């Protein structure tokens, strides 16, 4: 849900005023259903899993 | 003789009075310690209780405070005086104590100490001064805006016949001790970032962890390093942070430092940054005068320049006497109906200067001002001599 969706992590100083900081994923990699088996997440044993 | 004497009489809101108290300032150089600013205050209070122990009752010496700004380099002292029955002659009135007490505090070296009677009414809206605000309209920054002020504050002195006592309210920039730490070394030593930004701002800054109860009252529990462990920059190489290899690393193995310039008291106004300036009008001149030049001089300021005038200055915009006109329109309409004439009203209305001229002679003998007790003091002699007249007119008529 950070990858799609997104996540407002922080605050930072952009040219004086204070502004926000998001995190999400590039569109290409989030446009198709076959793209879920494209993403891998870490496991304690150290291996990514589709 | 009335019109001539009226404008040659300085005008003012209200005379200071002798309230039995007067206040004094004490400013010290940037970097001054709390201890140094206290040895000065020691001197001030002795003077009042020695070289003039027939007129002073007690001295309340507050180290570490100031109306311009706070910090270990400031202090205010307030003086309380004896009954007027124990003081006689105008040689012992607050003005006489004050000028004579400010004129003894000059030999002092390294301090800017100066006693002064306090404004009647506690109105920071001290009279005949203006209140200038210089804003940052674009995303310029501090070093940038701080420059543009020194610049307006240059001209301001180029017109001593117009403007005097013009100064910045706030505080000048001072040196800082900036300190950065490198992540690469940091992750490579096992040490976590959260472990650092906290063992610093806690030991050095003070951290308030929780609450505790004492004597039936809740209070705060704070944590900090011992006075003698957070004084100077060397002392920074004494703290160690535990790594994850279960090893300890000294603070001086992931960090660097130097000196930078920053500002205490950063001011701001209506959202964007500001420097406040206050001054007053030169002797003889007015304030409608002493503010127009400030407004222009300012317009030449390098673009993101804006003027916000506030407070004493702001209300001044108000008001034009559209009342002095109404007021006078009515006094006429009234006589018009009493005597039943558009013309006779004038014979009663003429007496105004006869009442006012004696007001002005009376004043100038002594040295008094165009304050509010005067302006009503006229209004009552105007009203009464116009009354006499209505009678002689109506008896004659």
């Amino acid at each position: 849900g950070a990858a799609w969706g997104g996540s407002y992590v922080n605050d930072f100083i952009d040219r004086g005023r204070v502004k926000k900081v998001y995190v999400m994923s590039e569109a290409k990699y989030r446009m198709l259903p076959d793209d879920i088996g494209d993403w891998y997440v870490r496991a304690a044993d150290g291996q990514m899993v589709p | 003789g009335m019109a001539y004497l009226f404008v040659r009489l300085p005008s003012s809101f209200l005379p200071d009075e002798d309230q039995g108290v007067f206040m004094t300032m004490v400013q010290l150089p940037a970097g001054a310690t709390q201890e140094r600013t206290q040895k000065v205050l020691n001197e001030v209070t002795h003077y009042y209780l020695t070289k003039e122990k027939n007129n002073v009752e007690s001295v309340f010496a507050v180290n570490g405070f100031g109306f311009a700004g706070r910090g270990q380099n400031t202090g205010i002292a307030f003086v309380s005086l004896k009954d007027w029955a124990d003081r006689p002659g105008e040689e012992n009135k607050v003005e006489a104590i004050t000028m004579r007490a400010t004129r003894a505090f000059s030999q002092i070296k390294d301090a800017m100490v100066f006693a002064f009677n306090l404004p009647a009414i506690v109105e920071l809206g001290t009279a005949t001064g203006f209140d200038f605000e210089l804003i940052d309209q674009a995303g310029l920054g501090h070093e940038k805006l701080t420059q543009a002020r020194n610049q307006l504050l240059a001209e301001a002195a180029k017109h001593p016949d117009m403007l005097t006592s013009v100064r910045p309210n706030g505080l000048e920039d001072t040196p800082q001790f900036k300190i950065d730490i490198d992540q690469e070394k940091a992750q490579a030593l096992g040490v976590s970032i959260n472990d650092i930004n906290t063992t610093l701002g806690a030991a050095w800054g003070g951290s308030y962890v929780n609450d505790f109860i004492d004597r039936g009252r809740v209070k705060k529990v704070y944590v900090m390093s011992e006075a003698k462990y957070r004084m100077l920059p060397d002392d920074i190489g004494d703290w160690y942070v535990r790594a994850a290899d279960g090893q300890m690393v000294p603070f001086s193995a992931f960090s660097s430092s130097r000196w930078e310039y920053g500002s205490p008291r950063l001011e701001r106004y209506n959202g964007l940054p500001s420097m406040e300036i206050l001054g007053q009008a030169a002797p003889g001149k007015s304030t409608g005068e002493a503010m127009e030049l400030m407004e222009q001089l300012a317009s030449k300021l390098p673009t993101y320049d804006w003027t916000g005038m506030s407070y004493q200055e702001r209300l001044s915009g108000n008001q034009a006497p559209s009342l002095y006109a109404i007021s006078l329109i009515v006094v006429f309409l009234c006589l018009a109906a009493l005597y039943e004439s558009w013309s006779i009203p004038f014979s009663v209305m003429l007496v105004v200067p006869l009442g006012v001229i004696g007001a002005l002679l009376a004043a100038t003998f002594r040295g008094l001002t165009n304050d509010v007790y005067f302006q009503v003091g006229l209004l009552t002699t105007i009203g009464l001599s116009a009354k006499n007249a209505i009678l002689i007119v109506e008896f004659a008529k």
Partner: protein, 250 residues
């Protein structure tokens, strides 16, 4: 005024039952009407800046001042104030054995403004002469500053930084809205009139506060009035005054 005081009072209880990430966004209580009083638009005659740039000036340099102007219930932005956007790539995160959770972690710890105390600070010791502040760790400013951000240290000696997995672009807070004036890239503010406030006086007020801040726009930054319901009130009202005088002469 009081109707707002209560509805706020009852909200302030519900606050801590809402997800961490709905509080950080800030919930707003307003007392406006539901119809736009006026839409004050903003174009760029020079085209020096894009429809994204345009929206971020409006957002960061005009909206608060108008939202604090007495009589203004609500200000709705047609576009989004910038925000440091970061776009992560799946193939590159797996390549290095990483997960997006980790990415979030490195940002919270390198982009932080922390309080560090000061030297010679109270309580002083016996015989202190020096007294300064201490500074470290200020917020990040440029995307570039963010690109540096260290993610991990390979045993190999490789530097996995934030750039290598994401494309950092200062970017909009959100991409939902795109305004266009006359088929031309634009932005603006939908202003709603707080309850009971005089429309005309309120309008005079924006106009006044909007004027205070024209003398500082960048190249070709023009203001436009695509939607304003106010002029019809002023003209209407003077049209009756006219038929008054008129009827007297007749």
């Amino acid at each position: 005024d009081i109707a707002q005081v209560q509805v706020q009072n009852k909200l302030q209880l519900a606050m801590p039952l809402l997800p961490q990430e709905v509080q950080q966004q800030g919930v707003s209580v307003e007392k406006s009407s539901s119809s736009f009083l006026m839409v004050v638009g903003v174009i760029n005659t020079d085209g020096t800046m894009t429809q994204e740039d345009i929206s971020d000036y409006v957002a960061a340099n005009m909206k608060d001042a108008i939202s604090r102007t007495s009589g203004v219930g609500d200000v709705q932005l047609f576009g989004s104030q910038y925000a440091m956007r970061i776009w992560m790539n799946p193939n590159e995160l797996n390549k290095f054995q990483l997960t997006p959770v980790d990415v979030i972690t490195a940002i919270k710890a390198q982009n932080a403004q922390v309080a560090a105390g000061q030297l010679g600070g109270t309580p002083p010791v016996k015989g202190q002469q020096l007294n300064a502040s201490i500074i470290a760790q200020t917020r990040l400013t440029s995307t570039e500053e963010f690109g540096k951000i260290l993610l991990k240290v390979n045993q190999d000696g490789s530097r996995v930084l934030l750039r290598d997995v994401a494309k950092i672009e200062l970017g909009g807070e959100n991409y939902d809205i795109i305004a266009e004036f006359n088929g031309q890239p634009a932005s603006g503010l939908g202003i709603k009139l707080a309850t009971g406030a005089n429309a005309l006086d309120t309008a005079a007020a924006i106009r006044a506060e909007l004027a205070k801040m024209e003398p500082f726009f960048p190249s070709g930054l023009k203001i436009v009035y695509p939607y304003d319901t106010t002029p019809f009130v002023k003209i209407s009202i003077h049209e009756v005054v006219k038929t008054l005088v008129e009827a007297i002469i007749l």
